[PDB]
Design an enzyme around this catalytic site. Sequence first.
Site, PDB file in Angstrom:
ATOM      1  N   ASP A   1     -11.897 -10.763 -70.764  1.00  0.00           N
ATOM      2  CA  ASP A   1     -11.400 -11.606 -71.870  1.00  0.00           C
ATOM      3  C   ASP A   1     -10.085 -11.046 -72.424  1.00  0.00           C
ATOM      4  O   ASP A   1      -9.863  -9.798 -72.312  1.00  0.00           O
ATOM      5  CB  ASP A   1     -12.375 -11.607 -73.036  1.00  0.00           C
ATOM      6  CG  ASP A   1     -13.511 -12.606 -72.874  1.00  0.00           C
ATOM      7  OD1 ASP A   1     -13.643 -13.107 -71.746  1.00  0.00           O
ATOM      8  OD2 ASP A   1     -14.285 -12.763 -73.871  1.00  0.00           O
ATOM      9  N   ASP A   2      -9.266 -11.949 -72.960  1.00  0.00           N
ATOM     10  CA  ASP A   2      -8.273 -11.724 -74.039  1.00  0.00           C
ATOM     11  C   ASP A   2      -6.888 -11.447 -73.472  1.00  0.00           C
ATOM     12  O   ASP A   2      -5.998 -11.269 -74.277  1.00  0.00           O
ATOM     13  CB  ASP A   2      -8.660 -10.588 -74.973  1.00  0.00           C
ATOM     14  CG  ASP A   2      -9.785 -10.833 -75.941  1.00  0.00           C
ATOM     15  OD1 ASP A   2     -10.049  -9.885 -76.652  1.00  0.00           O
ATOM     16  OD2 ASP A   2     -10.422 -11.970 -75.995  1.00  0.00           O
TER      17      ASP A   2
ATOM     18  N   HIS B   1      -9.795 -18.963 -72.891  1.00  0.00           N
ATOM     19  CA  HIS B   1     -10.402 -18.263 -74.046  1.00  0.00           C
ATOM     20  C   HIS B   1      -9.792 -18.806 -75.353  1.00  0.00           C
ATOM     21  O   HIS B   1      -9.814 -18.095 -76.360  1.00  0.00           O
ATOM     22  CB  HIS B   1     -10.206 -16.730 -73.876  1.00  0.00           C
ATOM     23  CG  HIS B   1     -11.102 -15.893 -74.724  1.00  0.00           C
ATOM     24  ND1 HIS B   1     -12.422 -16.263 -75.050  1.00  0.00           N
ATOM     25  CD2 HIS B   1     -10.889 -14.687 -75.317  1.00  0.00           C
ATOM     26  CE1 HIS B   1     -12.953 -15.283 -75.791  1.00  0.00           C
ATOM     27  NE2 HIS B   1     -12.013 -14.327 -75.965  1.00  0.00           N
TER      28      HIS B   1
ATOM     29  N   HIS C   1      -7.257 -17.900 -80.203  1.00  0.00           N
ATOM     30  CA  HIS C   1      -8.322 -16.866 -80.315  1.00  0.00           C
ATOM     31  C   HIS C   1      -8.908 -16.826 -81.721  1.00  0.00           C
ATOM     32  O   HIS C   1      -9.342 -15.776 -82.133  1.00  0.00           O
ATOM     33  CB  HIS C   1      -7.799 -15.501 -79.839  1.00  0.00           C
ATOM     34  CG  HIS C   1      -8.841 -14.484 -79.468  1.00  0.00           C
ATOM     35  ND1 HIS C   1      -8.761 -13.152 -79.892  1.00  0.00           N
ATOM     36  CD2 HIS C   1      -9.885 -14.531 -78.603  1.00  0.00           C
ATOM     37  CE1 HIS C   1      -9.756 -12.457 -79.348  1.00  0.00           C
ATOM     38  NE2 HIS C   1     -10.471 -13.284 -78.550  1.00  0.00           N
TER      39      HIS C   1
ATOM     40  N   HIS D   1     -13.236  -6.576 -71.388  1.00  0.00           N
ATOM     41  CA  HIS D   1     -11.972  -6.926 -72.068  1.00  0.00           C
ATOM     42  C   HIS D   1     -10.829  -6.395 -71.254  1.00  0.00           C
ATOM     43  O   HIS D   1     -10.940  -5.281 -70.698  1.00  0.00           O
ATOM     44  CB  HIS D   1     -11.989  -6.434 -73.500  1.00  0.00           C
ATOM     45  CG  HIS D   1     -12.883  -7.280 -74.332  1.00  0.00           C
ATOM     46  ND1 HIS D   1     -14.237  -7.070 -74.409  1.00  0.00           N
ATOM     47  CD2 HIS D   1     -12.600  -8.305 -75.148  1.00  0.00           C
ATOM     48  CE1 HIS D   1     -14.763  -7.932 -75.269  1.00  0.00           C
ATOM     49  NE2 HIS D   1     -13.790  -8.745 -75.686  1.00  0.00           N
TER      50      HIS D   1
HETATM   51 NI    NI Z   1     -11.861 -12.547 -77.153  1.00  0.00          NI
END
Ligand code: NI
Length: 186
Positions: free
Chosen positions: A9-10, A60, A64, A154
Amino acid sequence: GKEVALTFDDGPFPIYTEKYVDILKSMDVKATFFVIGKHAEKHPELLKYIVENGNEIGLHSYSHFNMKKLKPEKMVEELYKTQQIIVEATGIKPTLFRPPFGAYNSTLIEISNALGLKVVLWNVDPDDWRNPSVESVVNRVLSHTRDGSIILMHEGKPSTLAALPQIIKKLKEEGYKFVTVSELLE
Ligand code: NI
């Protein structure tokens, strides 16, 4: 046999995306990257790098933020903008969406489905966001991983980059095949 979906993620992130991708490619293993739109539009070459190496990209959201209380049209803007950044960079349309914090309602499911997106969470969480030691990240993943596991990790995290080679090695020894989330769900 048993399959597992490694997820990040991210991202994308300068330095780290390229490093995560190189480790995966070096080990003949593919993963799913759930990218934040604001990061994706700054770094289109990193999106191409993820996909050229056989990995899947999911959404995602653009901003965010927790999407639990958004109006339907703002859910649309957040998903559609991110879908368009990704397809303009890679030529490949994402089919998956992981909400920020995993927060959702029925309306977000319905809006996602109307944009051709499946909502995905995860079922193994070694808490790599609030940085543990690389040994405790490894042990949480290897103690919880089963056939059908979707592992939440992550991007942009040296501790995660450090744990990858041991996670891939040990799960390969346990007879796991590494798949994308899309392949895992079929
Ligand atoms: Ni996230």
